[PDB]
Each structure stands twice: as C-alpha cells, then as structure tokens.
Amino acid sequence: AMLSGKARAHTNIALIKYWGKANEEYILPMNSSLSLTLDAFYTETTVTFDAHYSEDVFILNGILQNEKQTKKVKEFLNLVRQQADCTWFAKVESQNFVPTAAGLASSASGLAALAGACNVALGLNLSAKDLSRLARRGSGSACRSIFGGFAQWNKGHSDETSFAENIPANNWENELAMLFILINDGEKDVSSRDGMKRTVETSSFYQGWLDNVEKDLSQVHEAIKTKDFPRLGEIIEANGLRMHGTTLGAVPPFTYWSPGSLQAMALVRQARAKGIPCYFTMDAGPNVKVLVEKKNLEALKTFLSEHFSKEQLVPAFAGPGIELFET
Amino acid sequence: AMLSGKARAHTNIALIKYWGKANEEYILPMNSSLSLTLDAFYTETTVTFDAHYSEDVFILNGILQNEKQTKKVKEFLNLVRQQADCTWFAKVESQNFVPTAAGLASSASGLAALAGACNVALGLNLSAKDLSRLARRGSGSACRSIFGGFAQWNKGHSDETSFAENIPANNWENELAMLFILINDGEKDVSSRDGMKRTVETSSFYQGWLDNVEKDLSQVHEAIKTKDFPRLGEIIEANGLRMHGTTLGAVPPFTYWSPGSLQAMALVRQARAKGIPCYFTMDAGPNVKVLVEKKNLEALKTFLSEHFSKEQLVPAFAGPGIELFET
Numbered sequence A, B: 001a002m003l004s005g006k007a008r009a010h011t012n013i014a015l016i017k018y019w020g021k022a023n024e025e026y027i028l029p030m031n032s033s034l035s036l037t038l039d040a041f042y043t044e045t046t047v048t049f050d051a052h053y054s055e056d057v058f059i060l061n062g063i064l065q066n067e068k069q070t071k072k073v074k075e076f077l078n079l080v081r082q083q084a085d086c087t088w089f090a091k092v093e094s095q096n097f098v099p100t101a102a103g104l105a106s107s108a109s110g111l112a113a114l115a116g117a118c119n120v121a122l123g124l125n126l127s128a129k130d131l132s133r134l135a136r137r138g139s140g141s142a143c144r145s146i147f148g149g150f151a152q153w154n155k156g157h158s159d160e161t162s163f164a165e166n167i168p169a170n171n172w173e174n175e176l177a178m179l180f181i182l183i184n185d186g187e188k189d190v191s192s193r194d195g196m197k198r199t200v201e202t203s204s205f206y207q208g209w210l211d212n213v214e215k216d217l218s219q220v221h222e223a224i225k226t227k228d229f230p231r232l233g234e235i236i237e238a239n240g241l242r243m244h245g246t247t248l249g250a251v252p253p254f255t256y257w258s259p260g261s262l263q264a265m266a267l268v269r270q271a272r273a274k275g276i277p278c279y280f281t282m283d284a285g286p287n288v289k290v291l292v293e294k295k296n297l298e299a300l301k302t303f304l305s306e307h308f309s310k311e312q313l314v315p316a317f318a319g320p321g322i323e324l325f326e327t
C-alpha cells in the first residue's frame, strides 16, 4: 500500500519581485511578479506515501531534516493530503543541484519539485496551470518554476485565479544569462516569508512599492517584445532596489544586504560604465545576481575576477519547466 | 575701506534628519529636524570685505578653493551682501578642526561660522534666531550649529519662521557621546543638496518619510524629558534608516552606504546584543556615527577595535553654540 512519484524542477529568479501576501493562508500575493527559470540550479525530488510509515520524513542531500527545516515541506504535505483525502505519512527525498555552500534559495525549485512529485504519486493529473496553483500553496515563488524561460505569476484574486504562466519571447531568453556572485559575509537573515509579512504590516514604504509594480511589469513586457535589453535591465534593477528599500521602512527596520552585496552592486555599476550592459538584482539574502547578455558574459566574468574568486562567479542560462516521472 | 569679522561654530549631527526642501531658493525644509552639536569638530572663519578686492576668494585649511569648491560660500556671500547692500568682494579664510582625511561633512560648521563672521563684519547685530535664519540660507544644516547641545530646526512656513533653537534637556546632553566610525571605501557620493532634491522629486518612498517625521520628533522630546536613552536611540536609529530608505526609491535610485557602512551598522547591532546600549545614524556619506552614553563609551570603543583601527574611531561630546569675535 504505497504511492510514489518523482519530479525535477529548476529554480527561477524574479526580475519583478513578489513581496508580500494579500492572503497568508493561500499565498495570494499583493502583486504580480515575473521571473526567469534557470538551467544551472535545480532540485530532484521523490515522494512516497505509505500506510506503514510512522511519521513524515524529509531527507535533503542525504541529511535527515529537523522539524524547523521541514516546515514548508510538512505544511505542503498536509495540504496536498487534504486535497487527495490521503491519510498516509510520507517520505520526501530531495537533492539540490546548486553550488556547494552557495546559500542559494531553494524553496522555489524544492517546493515545485515536491508539488510535481505529489501530483504523480497521488494521481492528481493536474494541468500546468493547476500544478502551478498547487505549488503556489507551498511557496509563492515555487509556482513560477512550473514553467521555463520567462514566467509571470498573475496575482489573481482567489485560489483559482492566482497562478503562473510562461511568457513567450521569441526565444529572447536564450540570448540571456544570469551570473551569480556568491556573498557569504551576510548576517543571519530574516526568512522571505517573515520579512515580507513584517514589510506588509509595518513598512511606511510598502504603498510606494505597490504603486510601482504594475508599470514595471508593463515595461518588462514592452521590452521583451522589442528585445530591448538596456530597458529590461533598468526596470528590473530599480524594481529590486525598490523591494529592498521597503525593509528599511519596516518596524523594526532591517536589510538583506551584506557588505559584499554593496561591493558587488557598485562593481556592476562600474562594469556598466565601462560599457558592459549588465544589471543586478537581489532576493532575500546577500547574493547578487547579474543579468547580462550571453555575448557579454565572459567580459563581465573577467572584470569581476578583480575582486571575487572564480568560485564566487557562477553562470546560469534559461532553463526548462517542471518534468514529472513515474516510479 | 574694509570690514572684517570672525566666528567659530561647531558641527552638529541630526538625530531626526532634514531631508528635502519645500522651497529651494530660501531653504525652507519639508520637515523639522533635531541635532546634537558636538565639541570635537568645528570651524574657525574670518571674512574681510574690502573695496580693493578684485574677486571673491575662499581659502580652506590654507588651500585656495576652486569655483566648484566655493559654490555654497559664494552664494552665501551674494545673499548676505544683498542683505547689507554691500558691493565689495570678500576674502574668506576658514580652518576645519576635523580629523585628517576623515571626510566629515563641514557645511554645517563652515556656513554657520561664515554667517557669524559676516554678521560681525557687516554690523548686522543679529539675534541668535536671526543668525540662525541667515545661516539657514547658506546651508540648511548650518542653522542648527548656531546653538549648542540639542537644537531643533522648526520648518516654519516662511523665511521669517524657519529657524533653529536650543532644546533645554536638564544637561542630559552632557551624559552623552557620539563615536564616529570613519569609513573610506565609499563610492563617489551625490551631494546632500542634489540627493535630497532627487528624492523629493522622484522617490516613491518620500511620502512615507514625511508621514513619520513628526511622531519621531515628539518621541525624541518625550525621551529627552525622561532621559530615556534606549527610547531616544531606537527612534533616531529608525529615523536615519528611513531617511536612507528614501534614496532606494528615487529615480534613478542610489545609496550613500558603502560596504564598510553596513559592517559598522551590523557591529552596532551586535554591540547592543552584548548589552552595550548604542544606536547608529548616517548622513549623506559612508561614515557611521554611534550615539552612546558616556559611561559606555570605552566599552563600545574596545568592542569596535576588533574590526577598525583606532584612527577610525573618534569620540565627540556635546558642544557649544556659535562664538563671534571682533577683528
């Protein structure tokens, strides 16, 4: 009496940020977002539901995860089980294909992969849209990893209308790259879920954030239509900076930046001034991702080696949507 | 046919920031502010108006200043001359008593001192209030350096009603200190005048800044009345962070922070967690000022030597208002 399934899902990085929930229980977002799915970084996950299991078990890179480390996994299992009316404990075994000690965020690829594996195990037979909705409920950013290339998460107004979709771009995503700059001098960081909640509830800058998301999204779409990279880059760099601005107005205020983050951001500006078109973005942590055209990627990598070891500079390209496998 | 005068004025650091002009021509501020005048850092200035001078001349620490370096000085001379109906070119000789290469902001102490010296030379015989109004027109933050200890700049609504005054605190300012952490890894920085203008005109976060200044000011006043240092510190640290937040929402966005600024801010947080009550604040540049009680200053200095040379840690205490001298 067992049911099992497997999936592989790639990470995505938001160019227009999701920051703050309109509904915390269903992870309905206050604003729509837009991401690029990447090839380099991904998660492979198997799940087994078995009547003979005695508790939920989560293994990550071969290491048994403790209660706190399993929290998003455990909550997703309960909600997928309630949706299937399944009463069995599960075993989740996941492997993250990210660079050693990089400290990448893996909730997007991990919960997306877990959602795909559960869809297979429990025979839910979900469409891509409904698979995105399911993964949304484990982690908002996971719903975009269902899709490859550019994807948009439409905020919607309901569990039924909040989900992601691919954005066709005439293969423009295949001309682009993202160079990760790995920064480790970071303080202990508020989780994305807790930080965005504190920002929604207390930041005097959050209305300014909301008032600007939709125009940024429209201009990303216009830029994609004309393959206008400097225009894309200027929009997404300011969007990310605006997102981080909101945490300095929270109560108490906080920042995700480390000293190295600022050095990296300053160097991106110098690279642009030397004529290398490239634009930075940060999520809920100190790493700095640099959006650049493929033709300019080695120039950018060379320039940045003056201050960062080669271990600290990891390129990624456009990647595919989720893949499901039977066991 | 010559007229001369001299003044000494001390720097002040704003605990509640002035950020943005409601009227650029007269430097009427969008919000009121509140500062501590310091003992360690000051400017001495002599001015001579002479019918036989052939142009305005500004000497700073014995170095002839070029046109761009003289701009605020030159503009103040023209406006004080128009107020006296004086037609003579001037020579300004100023010396800044600040630490070598520290990169301290000297417009407050320098324009205040210049205003005091011109008041003497031209026999304007100004009250402290009217001297504050005069200095306001050269540089907003200079109007607070007329006064010692705590001073408030009331935004007013007119050239007549915008000026600073001392805040009596039952000598509480004499129990306090400010430890400067000198940071030099800073990019080339937008001037305070240009940055605050860009923030007023373009930042989506500026309304959030305005909406919070008056409650911060009220709570500083309540804290002064009860000599409640942790309450003072929490208010002013968040006020400063909110000020810097506004520049990340400007168009284009920018920051005054350097990598070292963030390291310093993180270390202040660690110091507080080790039980040292201290609170940071930054102006339009990378240096970090740390407000601390005198009894806790050497503990703070010791703790911080783990990451900064002793040249980088300069203490200051409460200081006096402006002093005028005849020639």
Ligand SMILES: Nc1ncnc2c1ncn2[C@@H]1O[C@H](COP(=O)(O)OP(=O)(O)CP(=O)(O)O)[C@@H](O)[C@H]1O
Binding pocket: A043, A045, A060, A068, A069, A070, A071, A072, A073, A074, A094, A095, A096, A104, A105, A106, A107, A108, A109, A110, A111, A114, A139, A190, A191, A192, A193, A283, A284, A285
């Ligand atoms: N490969 C994986 N497979 C399944 N679940 C995973 C996983 N990697 C992480 N998780 C789950 O996601 C949780 C971490 O997600 P969370 O969103 O809080 O952090 P993160 O890594 O995405 C950085 P941030 O908090 O800034 O978004 C882990 O505690 C675990 O429950």
Ligand SMILES: Nc1ncnc2c1ncn2[C@@H]1O[C@H](COP(=O)(O)OP(=O)(O)CP(=O)(O)O)[C@@H](O)[C@H]1O
Binding pocket: B043, B045, B060, B068, B069, B070, B071, B072, B073, B074, B094, B095, B096, B104, B105, B106, B107, B108, B109, B110, B111, B114, B139, B190, B191, B192, B193, B283, B284, B285
């Ligand atoms: N000791 C002094 N005496 C007279 N004028 C002085 C002076 N020191 C500086 N100044 C004047 O003030 C100008 C600098 O003021 P400004 O406000 O732009 O810079 P600042 O040193 O206060 C840092 P910030 O721009 O961040 O406030 C100088 O160019 C000069 O005109």
Ligand SMILES: C[C@@](O)(CCOP(=O)(O)OP(=O)(O)O)CC(=O)O
Binding pocket: A013, A014, A016, A017, A018, A019, A027, A033, A105, A107, A138, A139, A140, A141, A142, A192, A193, A282, A283, A284
């Ligand atoms: C900063 C971000 O990466 C936010 C990541 O937050 P999460 O998606 O991890 O949060 P939950 O929805 O609460 O699970 C920006 C983005 O991915 O859009």
Ligand SMILES: C[C@@](O)(CCOP(=O)(O)OP(=O)(O)O)CC(=O)O
Binding pocket: B013, B014, B016, B017, B018, B019, B027, B033, B105, B107, B138, B139, B140, B141, B142, B192, B193, B282, B283, B284
């Ligand atoms: C960041 C601040 O130090 C602003 C200093 O700005 P200035 O007073 O130098 O600007 P102008 O009025 O245009 O001369 C905060 C403060 O002193 O209140």
Ligand SMILES: [Mg+2]
Binding pocket: A105, A106, A107, A108, A139, A141, A192
């Ligand atoms: Mg995450």
Ligand SMILES: [Mg+2]
Binding pocket: B105, B106, B107, B108, B139, B141, B192
């Ligand atoms: Mg100044």
